[PDB]
Design an enzyme around this catalytic site. Structure first.
Site, PDB file in Angstrom:
ATOM      1  N   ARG A   1      -3.394 -10.328   4.412  1.00 46.88           N
ATOM      2  CA  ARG A   1      -3.858 -10.316   3.028  1.00 46.88           C
ATOM      3  C   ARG A   1      -2.773  -9.704   2.153  1.00 46.88           C
ATOM      4  O   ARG A   1      -2.622  -8.480   2.085  1.00 46.88           O
ATOM      5  CB  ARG A   1      -5.163  -9.514   2.926  1.00 46.88           C
ATOM      6  CG  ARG A   1      -5.791  -9.474   1.563  1.00 46.88           C
ATOM      7  CD  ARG A   1      -6.989  -8.527   1.529  1.00 46.88           C
ATOM      8  NE  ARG A   1      -7.393  -8.173   0.161  1.00 46.88           N
ATOM      9  CZ  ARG A   1      -6.849  -7.194  -0.564  1.00 46.88           C
ATOM     10  NH1 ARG A   1      -5.862  -6.449  -0.078  1.00 46.88           N
ATOM     11  NH2 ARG A   1      -7.282  -6.966  -1.788  1.00 46.88           N
TER      12      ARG A   1
ATOM     13  N   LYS B   1       0.799  -1.219   0.000  1.00 50.94           N
ATOM     14  CA  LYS B   1       0.000   0.000   0.000  1.00 50.94           C
ATOM     15  C   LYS B   1       0.834   1.273   0.000  1.00 50.94           C
ATOM     16  O   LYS B   1       2.046   1.217   0.216  1.00 50.94           O
ATOM     17  CB  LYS B   1      -1.003  -0.034   1.132  1.00 50.94           C
ATOM     18  CG  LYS B   1      -2.263  -0.698   0.670  1.00 50.94           C
ATOM     19  CD  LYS B   1      -3.074  -1.280   1.782  1.00 50.94           C
ATOM     20  CE  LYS B   1      -4.457  -1.566   1.275  1.00 50.94           C
ATOM     21  NZ  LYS B   1      -5.302  -2.165   2.306  1.00 50.94           N
TER      22      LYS B   1
HETATM   23  C1  LIG Z   1      -7.030  -2.752  -1.050  1.00 47.10           C
HETATM   24  C2  LIG Z   1      -7.809  -3.552  -0.312  1.00 47.10           C
HETATM   25  C3  LIG Z   1      -9.052  -4.192  -0.881  1.00 47.10           C
HETATM   26  N1  LIG Z   1      -9.768  -5.105   0.005  1.00 47.10           N
HETATM   27  C4  LIG Z   1      -9.363  -5.248   1.211  1.00 47.10           C
HETATM   28  N2  LIG Z   1     -10.090  -6.134   2.093  1.00 47.10           N
HETATM   29  C5  LIG Z   1      -9.770  -6.313   3.315  1.00 47.10           C
HETATM   30  N3  LIG Z   1     -10.487  -7.117   4.046  1.00 47.10           N
HETATM   31  N4  LIG Z   1      -8.700  -5.691   3.887  1.00 47.10           N
HETATM   32  C6  LIG Z   1      -7.899  -4.844   3.205  1.00 47.10           C
HETATM   33  O1  LIG Z   1      -6.940  -4.306   3.742  1.00 47.10           O
HETATM   34  C7  LIG Z   1      -8.193  -4.574   1.787  1.00 47.10           C
HETATM   35  N5  LIG Z   1      -7.470  -3.810   1.067  1.00 47.10           N
END
Ligand SMILES: C=C1CN=c2nc(N)[nH]c(=O)c2=N1
Ligand SMILES: C=C1CN=c2nc(N)[nH]c(=O)c2=N1
Lengths: 265, 265
Positions: free
Chosen positions: B245, B211
């Site tokens: 994730r 990110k």
């Molecule tokens: C960029 C994204 C898109 N979906 C996500 N979904 C979850 N659960 N957590 C995240 O940090 C997340 N980042």
């Protein structure tokens, strides 16, 4: 500011509040002692590490021989690097005579893997030249009653010798000695309880770079131990380490820098 | 054992005491919707991630369009992967209708980036199909009185909607929502105080992969954010996260495995 003093290293000065400081391991691939290929390869490696975020260069004869020859190997190395790379050099020996040569060749910090127990006389040199000395936990057996309790104990017996020698509190750094006199399981535990070393009130340096306990967990040979190293360094920094001693300077520097942002340092 | 229950996902079951669980991001490069190149490339990417240590596959339409078309995009994807990769699939949507399609296409977990606030009706689907739902912290403004205090608050309003819908405590996972409605400085703080989410008594999933707050600290574009990611994942795991994730599954799996050995998990 946890630390109300900077680390004084002759020409250079190292701050302890600003960032986790990176010590870059300089190897020593030897073949008489001092020829062009040896000292050349050492210099561009130190140059490269300076370029990738390193704050100190650690120059070590041996790894895992004659005292008179260890000097002839390692003296020329320090002379060159200190001339060509503006950055403090530490010298990875336990031997008293070796250290004296190195500081006078140009080295700035002593790094003793036997915490002044190998040759008590070392601490005196450190005292006489007024350089910062790293005292690592080590011992010729592995029979602990209580791992951490005994570490801290043995580390104190190191400080006792340092202090009685003339070493000021301000030139003392401690090292849990990961990989030394500890099982793969014991190394995990020292990592787990690394914060305890903090009660002694000294800066702490952590050396886990590429080591085999990483290998034992991950089941991966030395050249595939970058991520596992990462992890050790991050858990280290979070538990309050001031220096880390790594081979992969570029990568480990970026990880320190993240941890630093995150934890508030 | 902190957790006296396993996570039930239809055919597969995920244990929460054994290891930090890795969620591998599956991208969605689209061009009508369902053709051979699209679903092929998705499948070998999921296969690759299975091979590198991933425990879940997260399939997401969008990133950062028609509801009727989002389904036509993402349904075929889930059908294929669940057939060809024995591993639970989560579906990255906030939209109620989308999720229903996906679970019936084969998906096992809902992953809602608006914590049931976007379409309350989602939580009902999750309830009706009995799947585990991830509730992420989000909000259309960034005016916090107290970052962490408000996070936990907003996260609770998510649980309120989930629970009133029929969602059992045992199918609820929480996410601090790194990158969402937070400044680069605020993201550092949530990372710093990530342990607080634990007082709510639910498993926590952390998504910081690649990110931009990593970018802001390190000053490095997306393809050079592997180490910084590492750091976020390690500090996360140490603060008690159950899932992470990430994109770079191979590397992040090895780091989780070290942290796990170290912290005692
Ligand atoms: C960029 C994204 C898109 N979906 C996500 N979904 C979850 N659960 N957590 C995240 O940090 C997340 N980042
Ligand atoms: C393998 C080695 C050689 N020298 C070292 N020196 C210090 N100070 N700390 C270490 O962890 C260390 N590991």
């Amino acid at each position: 500011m946890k630390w109300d003093y900077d680390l004084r290293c002759g020409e250079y000065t190292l701050n302890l509040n600003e960032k986790t400081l990176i010590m870059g391991i300089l190897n020593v691939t030897p073949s008489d002692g001092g020829s062009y290929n040896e000292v050349d390869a050492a210099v561009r490696h130190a140059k490269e590490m300076r370029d990738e975020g390193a704050h100190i260069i650690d120059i070590g004869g041996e790894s895992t021989v004659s005292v008179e020859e260890e000097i002839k190997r390692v003296v020329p190395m320090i002379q060159a690097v200190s001339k060509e790379v503006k950055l403090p050099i530490s010298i990875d020996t336990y031997k008293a005579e070796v250290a004296k040569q190195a500081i006078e060749a140009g080295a700035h910090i002593i790094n003793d893997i036997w915490g002044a127990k190998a040759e008590p006389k070392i601490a005196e040199v450190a005292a006489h030249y007024d350089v910062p000395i790293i005292l690592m936990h080590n011992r010729d057996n592995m029979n602990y009653r209580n791992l951490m309790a005994d570490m801290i104990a043995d580390l104190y017996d190191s400080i006792k010798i340092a202090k009685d020698a003339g070493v000021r509190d301000e030139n003392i750094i401690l090292d849990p000695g990961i990989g030394f006199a500890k099982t793969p399981e014991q190394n995990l535990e020292a990592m787990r309880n690394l914060e305890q070393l903090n009660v002694l009130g000294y800066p702490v340096l952590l050396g886990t770079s590429r080591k085999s306990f990483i290998g034992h967990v991950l089941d991966l040979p030395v050249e595939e131990r970058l991520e596992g190293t990462g992890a050790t360094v991050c858990l280290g920094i979070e538990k309050g380490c001031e220096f880390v001693r790594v081979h992969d300077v570029k990568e480990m520097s970026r990880m320190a820098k993240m941890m630093d942002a995150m934890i508030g340092k």
